[PDB]
């Protein structure tokens, strides 16, 4: 809802932004392993998958991290602060 | 910060997770273009860069979108407490 326009005045000027990424749980399927576990909630940020921190990672990176463990899946999740 | 373990009982099972990613402003440098702008803040979720939706986009692809326009950076951002 907020429009931002940042205009450089010199070629080597920086914007001053450090942009990062959060992978989060958008939805949990009914009656699923995730739903029946109880500890994951929609909105949760995924901080760690199968022992590897996920920050700055892409969904493609997470997919291979998830597929690394064949039958099982370990994560660290954290509540969305504004839930 | 909650450790979660999901265990499948069949190979064809699913965990039941729809995961997504948001790009967000992790830091704004002091005395920078971003610092002086009224409309952009640490914590902001970036919804669009230079006219392109960034939902689920990797930081690598976000970097190429930013580099595409030499001199100016347009975004749509949302307050973290609004997402």
């Amino acid at each position: 809802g907020s429009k931002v326009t940042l205009v450089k005045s010199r070629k080597n000027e920086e914007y001053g932004l450090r942009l990062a990424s959060h992978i989060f749980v958008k939805e949990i399927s009914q009656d699923s392993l995730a739903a029946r576990d109880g500890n994951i909630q929609e909105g949760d940020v995924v901080l760690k998958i199968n022992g590897t921190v996920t920050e700055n990672m892409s969904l493609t990176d997470a997919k291979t991290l998830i597929e690394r463990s064949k039958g099982k899946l370990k994560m660290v999740v954290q509540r969305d602060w504004n839930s | 910060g909650s450790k979660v373990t999901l265990v499948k009982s069949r190979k064809n099972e699913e965990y039941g997770l729809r995961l997504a990613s948001h790009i967000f402003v992790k830091e704004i440098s002091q005395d920078s273009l971003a610092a002086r702008d009224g409309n952009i803040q640490e914590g902001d979720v970036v919804l669009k860069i230079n006219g392109t939706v960034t939902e689920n986009m990797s930081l690598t692809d976000a970097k190429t979108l930013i580099e595409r326009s030499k001199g100016k950076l347009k975004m749509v951002v949302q307050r973290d407490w609004n997402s």
Partner: peptide, 9 residues
């Protein structure tokens, strides 16, 4: 964050 560097612009 780790292993994947941040994006600084």
């Amino acid at each position: 964050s780790s292993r994947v560097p941040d994006l600084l612009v």
